[PDB]
């Protein structure tokens, strides 16, 4: 045994499930109509909605 | 084949319906996505997305700056994206007050890591760097996201804001007081062949000359001290083989009636800059001159 | 609104598996000898160019002036080639032996290491490669051609063994040797002879011409130049005319190796690294 | 600064020196970058001292 002791720390992850409770109509969500923008490549064009 | 098709007027590529509209209306459905005018359809700015860490995104929230990439020999980052303002430390042309200013803004890990990477190998900067163009947008999370422009103009979407490229004043360089009507802008990197001070000279030249032979001929006569320094280091230290005393490449062209002055602001640290409003990007590779 | 699409017909019966092989090569590059409209497959690629006694440099000199088309679509009994124009952007397959990244400048090279095959035909497509590896390959091949005559010694075999391999990011790749059976091909013989001639004339005439110019020396630069040449160095004028014209014709017989025009610059590669998006450049 | 021909020994003067980076030699200047030009003249000589006890006699 040496002259010193050892305190050792260690974290441990836990796969868990929360449950979220909220009141009626807490926040207001404001949306618009989704817009398509277009990026042109040759063989595969993309559209970002 | 017949005369009516070649006698018809050309079909309006915008006023004809989109591919989604001619797919919907032939089958008559509805969706929550508004379709009838696609964005970016009348665009010629050839964009390219880019991921950057937080240390290289300072001085980039304001749009318009050179997103010049580099490569390190270490295999985990194959490239990195330096800004032109961040290259000012290795720029010998940058004054000491301006250098002490812009070292007080890039104090994150990535900037100084790139600074250590720049001056380590047996090469110069012209085979170390690679130019891309100008940045116009920024997402600005922790790992940000940049959209450069390789070829075209610098505009916001829906064409309502012509973005402008700024360069710092210690890299601006014009050569005649009578500026031409149309002028081009090139990226000069010269080398002073001093032993310890092999840090290069960075210049953004704005001239009316578009030819290449008559540009390097008037470029030999404006860096003759560094040319003689190249020959001097060639003769006093033989059996070492340097090369590419200067390198130029075509960056783009501007209109010469709107190249003006401004100042960047970033965490209330102003910096006087030369601003190019209606910039275009038409790249050329790193050519050299002795 | 159809675009410029060269109709490339074939001259041979193909199975369905042959078309299934060929439909994997959509976004690839193809060299074409002339900007035509209707063409067979005998003028489609590089196998029409490949000579037994001519090599890499003579293939490259016949590669600077080719319309680098693509393959937009393949269908029954025909191919639809797509000529690119400078300014637009197109998808290019990663058919080269070496991968790319985001931001590189890409150019063309003959395939050093070894597709459709017929009895007399083998469809072959050129390597597309970033610029620093291209310059590395040029400076490897010229020096490996320069070790041709003194190949008999035991050290220089290890030296050309070292020179035979290159290194890119995770690409420990090696090239074939230009010299076959201890005598150089006439292509690389001309390529090395031009370099030896321009060096041997530069080490001979420049001293006389710089000491002629030194009386009209109006700069602080030419004197250091002639001092350098003097430190190294320790007839009828038609011979001088012939020597200067020989110098410039051996320079003119060399410009296939002195440079490479940038053709493609990548913008974003596909994940799993099989294709990319490239703006074409002249 | 000693003036040999006209015999006017100038007693004590400030000067500001640097390494001229084209070579490994010194360049002397005044307080406004005047580039002191006595060293071209054969009529004068100078003595230089530095705050690290260095001694430079210049003809």
DSSP class per residue in D1-57: -EETTTT--------EEEEETTTTEEEEE-TT-----GGG-TTEEEEEE-TT--EEE
CA torsion sign, C239 to C245 to C247 to C253? negative
- In this structure, how many other beta carbons lie within 10 angstroms of the beta carbon of residue C236? 7
Task: Return d(Cα B130, Cα B151) in angstroms, integer.
Answer: 15
Residue B215, H or E segment: helix B213-220
Q: With a CB-CB cutoff of 8 Å, which residues 5-44 of chain A face chain C?
A: 40-44
SS (H, E, C) C178-196: CCECCECCHHHHHHHHHHH
d(CA B127, CA B124) in angstroms, rounded, equals 6
Tokens of D55: 């001694």
DSSP character at residue C117: B
Q: CA–CA separation, A44 vs C269, rounded Å?
A: 13
The token pair at A2 is: 């040496």
C137 within 8 A of C165, measured Cβ to Cβ: no
Q: How many CB atoms are located within 10 Å of the residue C114 CB?
A: 7
Angle at B90 between CA B84 and CA B91, to 5 degrees: 70
Phi, psi of B250 (to 5 degrees): -80, 120
Cα separation of C95 and C275, whole Å? 8
> Among A39, A43, A45, which would you mutate to test the C interface (most chain C Cβ atoms within 10 Å of its Cβ)?
A43
Q: Which residues is A35 bridged to in the sheet?
A: B34
DSSP secondary-structure letter at C86? B
Tell me how far the alpha carbon of residue A29 is from its chain's centroid. Answer: 19
CB contact under 8 A, A35 and B39: yes
CB–CB of B170/B93 below 8 Å? yes
As given in the structure block, the two tokens for residue B126 are: 């012209």
Flag whether residue C282 sits within 8 Å of chain B, measured between CB atoms.
no
Distance between CA atoms of residues C282 and B128, nearest Å = 23
The experimental method behind these coordinates is cryo-EM
| Contact status, residue B185 vs residue B254, Cβ threshold 8 Å | yes
**Residue C193: how many other CB atoms lie within 10 Å:** 16
Helices B224-236 and C222-232: crossing angle, nearest 10°?
Answer: 20
Q: Phi and psi for B251 in degrees, rounded to 5?
A: -95, -45
**C125: which 2 tokens?**
């497509």
Beta bridge mates, B246: B190, B289
Distance CA C217, CA D5 (A): 37
Q: How would you classify residue B138: left for phi > 0, otherwise alpha for psi between -120 and 50, otherwise beta?
A: beta
Buried b (16+ CB within 10 A) or exposed e, B235-266: eeeeeeeeebbbbbbbbbbbebeebeeeebee
Rounded Cα–Cα distance for residues C45 and C43 (Å): 6
Measure CA of the first residue to CA of the last residue in chain B; give whole Å. Answer: 58
Q: What tokens were used for C7?
A: 């109709």
As to burial, measured by CB atoms within 10 angstroms (0-12 exposed, 13-18 middle, 19+ buried), residue C57 is: buried
Please list every residue in chain B whose beta carbon sits closer than 8 Å to the beta carbon of residue A39. Answer: 40, 47
CB contact under 8 A, B285 and C105: yes
Number of C-beta neighbours around residue A37 at 10 A: 14
**Resolution of the experimental model in angstroms, please?**
4.2
User: From residue C228, how far is each of B2, B237, C196, C234 by CA, in Å?
Assistant: 75, 11, 21, 11
E runs forming strands in chain B? 34-39, 46-52, 67-70, 80-83, 129-130, 134-138, 144-151, 165-168, 172-173, 183-190, 201-207, 246-248, 250-254, 260-266, 269-276, 280-281, 287-289
Q: Report angle CA C272, C273, C275 to the nearest 5 degrees.
A: 125
Using CB atoms, pick whichever of B46, B49, B224 lies closest to residue C279.
B46
CA distance B158 to B41: 10
């Amino acid at each position: 045994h040496p002259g010193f002791a050892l305190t050792a720390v260690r974290t441990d992850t836990f796969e868990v499930d929360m449950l979220l409770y909220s009141g009626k109509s807490c926040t207001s969500v404001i949306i618009n109509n989704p817009i398509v923008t277009k990026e042109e490549r040759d063989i595969s064009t993309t559209y970002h909605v | 084949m017949d005369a009516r098709a070649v006698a018809k007027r050309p079909r309006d590529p915008a006023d004809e319906d989109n591919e989604l509209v001619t797919a919907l209306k032939a089958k008559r459905e509805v969706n929550t996505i508004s379709v009838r005018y696609l964005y970016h359809a009348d665009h010629q700015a050839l964009t390219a997305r880019f991921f950057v860490p937080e240390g290289l995104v300072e001085f980039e929230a304001q749009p318009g700056a050179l997103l010049i990439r580099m490569e390190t020999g270490c295999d985990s980052p194959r490239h990195l994206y330096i800004s032109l303002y961040l290259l000012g430390i290795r720029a010998s042309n940058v004054s000491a007050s301006t250098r002490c200013l812009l070292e007080s803004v890039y104090t994150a890990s990535a900037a100084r890591a790139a600074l250590q990477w720049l001056d380590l190998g047996p090469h110069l900067l012209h085979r170390r760097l690679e130019t891309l163009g100008c940045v116009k947008t920024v997402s600005l999370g922790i790992t940000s996201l940049l959209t450069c422009v390789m070829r075209g103009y610098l505009y916001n979407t829906l064409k309502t804001e012509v973005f402008a490229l700024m360069i710092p004043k210690d890299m601006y360089l014009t050569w005649e007081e009578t500026r031409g009507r149309l002028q081009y802008v090139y990226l000069i990197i010269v080398y002073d062949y001093d032993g310890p001070e092999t840090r290069p000279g960075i210049y953004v030249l704005t001239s009316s000359i578009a030819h290449w032979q008559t540009l390097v001929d008037v470029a030999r006569g404006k860096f003759a001290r560094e040319r003689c320094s190249f020959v001097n280091r060639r003769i006093t230290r033989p059996r070492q083989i340097p090369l590419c005393t200067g390198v130029i490449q075509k960056l783009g062209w501007c209109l010469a009636d709107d190249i003006h002055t401004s100042f960047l602001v970033h965490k209330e640290l102003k910096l006087s800059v030369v601003r190019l409003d209606n910039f275009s990007v038409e790249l050329g590779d790193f050519r050299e001159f002795v | 609104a159809m675009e410029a699409n060269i109709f490339c017909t074939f001259d041979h019966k193909l199975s369905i598996a042959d078309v299934g092989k060929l439909t994997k090569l959509v976004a690839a590059v193809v060299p074409i000898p002339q900007r035509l409209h209707l063409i067979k497959h005998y003028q489609l690629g590089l196998h029409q160019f490949v000579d037994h006694t001519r090599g890499y440099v003579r293939l490259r000199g016949l590669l600077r002036n080719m319309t680098l088309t693509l393959m937009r679509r393949v269908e029954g009994n025909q191919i639809l080639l797509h000529v690119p124009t400078h300014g637009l952007l197109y998808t290019v397959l990663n058919t080269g032996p070496v991968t790319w990244e985001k931001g590189d400048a890409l150019c063309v090279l003959p395939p050093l290491f070894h597709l459709l095959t017929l009895g007399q035909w083998e469809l072959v497509l050129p390597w597309i490669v970033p610029m620093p590896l291209a310059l590395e390959i040029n400076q490897r091949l010229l020096i490996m051609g320069l070790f041709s005559l003194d190949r008999s010694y035991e050290e220089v075999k290890a030296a050309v063994q070292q020179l035979q391999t290159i290194t890119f990011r995770d690409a420990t790749f090696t090239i074939p040797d230009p010299v076959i059976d201890q005598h150089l091909l006439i292509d690389m013989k001309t390529a090395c002879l031009s370099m030896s001639m321009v060096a041997n004339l530069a080490s001979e005439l420049t001293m006389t011409y710089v000491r002629k110019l030194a009386l009209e020396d109006s700069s602080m630069l030419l004197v250091k130049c002639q001092e350098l040449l003097m430190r190294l160095d320790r007839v009828s004028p038609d011979d001088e005319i012939a020597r200067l014209s020989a110098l410039f014709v051996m320079l003119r017989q060399l410009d296939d190796l002195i440079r490479e025009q940038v053709v493609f610059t990548v913008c974003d590669v596909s994940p799993d690294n099989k294709s990319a998006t490239c703006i074409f450049k002249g | 600064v000693v003036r040999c021909v006209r015999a006017q020994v100038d007693l004590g003067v400030e000067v500001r020196a640097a390494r001229c980076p084209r070579t490994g030699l010194w360049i002397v200047r005044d307080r406004r970058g005047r580039l002191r030009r006595w060293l071209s003249q054969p009529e004068v000589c100078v003595l230089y001292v530095t705050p690290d006890l260095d001694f430079y006699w210049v003809l």
